[PDB]
Design a protein around this ligand. Structure first.
Ligand SMILES: Cc1cn([C@H]2CCCN(Cc3ccc(C(=O)O)c(Oc4cccc(C(F)(F)F)c4)c3)C2)c(=O)[nH]c1=O
Length: 191
């Protein structure tokens, strides 16, 4: 079994990369693709609070992402790993660190402590960081506030990334991003 997370800002080609890598890995491994809340009822109820209300305090939002993360881990990820599956997870602890910790300004260390409570030692075995420049990312997506937030997210990921992390150059055409990500994963799985 293996727990592999995928991280990156918007415009990194993360959705395409995970889907293509899943279609290639399924030939040789029992693999599943997931994201939080991923159908877990409690996580889905939390997601409705976050989305359908109520122009939220950033710390309350961080705690709700962390609570959805725990429910998804306990009810979906852990049982799949017990069946010997390769779990491909779109966003995990690092997204809370970059978005809530860095970009939203709570502080990475405060958000880290919150997330360590939520995951209780269950760190990914491997984390693919889709390293896109802000400029290429901006082009893949298509105001000043959105652009600045996109840049801060990238800045946050850079601070976080500085052992389980494997940075893939996401400025390349997507076929190459897919190939580099697939090769990184197979090297880890076959080791
Ligand atoms: C995992 C994670 C992600 N993001 C960002 C990434 C970029 C998109 N952002 C907006 C965004 C976009 C779509 C949705 C939707 O799913 O439709 C959405 O909602 C939820 C997503 C995941 C979990 C929950 C639940 F509430 F359940 F925790 C709600 C939020 C969310 C953080 O900021 N921190 C984190 O930890």
């Amino acid at each position: 079994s293996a727990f592999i997370t995928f991280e990156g800002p918007e415009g990194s080609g993360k959705t395409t990369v995970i889907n293509e890598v899943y279609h290639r890995l399924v030939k040789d491994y029992d693999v599943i693709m997931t994201r939080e809340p991923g159908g877990v009822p409690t996580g889905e109820e939390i997601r409705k609070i976050v989305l359908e209300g109520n122009d939220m305090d950033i710390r309350t939002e961080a705690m709700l992402f962390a609570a959805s993360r725990r429910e998804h881990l306990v009810l979906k990820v852990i049982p799949a790993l017990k069946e010997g599956k390769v779990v491909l997870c779109d966003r995990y602890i690092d997204s809370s660190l970059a978005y809530q910790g860095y970009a939203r300004g709570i502080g990475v260390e405060e958000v880290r402590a919150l997330n360590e409570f939520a995951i209780n030692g269950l760190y990914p075995d491997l984390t693919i960081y889709l390293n896109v420049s802000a400029e290429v990312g901006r082009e893949r997506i298509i105001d000043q506030e959105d652009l600045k937030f996109h840049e801060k997210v990238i800045e946050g990921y850079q601070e976080i990334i500085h052992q389980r992390f494997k940075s893939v150059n996401a400025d390349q055409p997507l076929e190459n991003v897919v190939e580099d990500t697939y090769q990184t994963i197979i090297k880890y799985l076959e080791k």
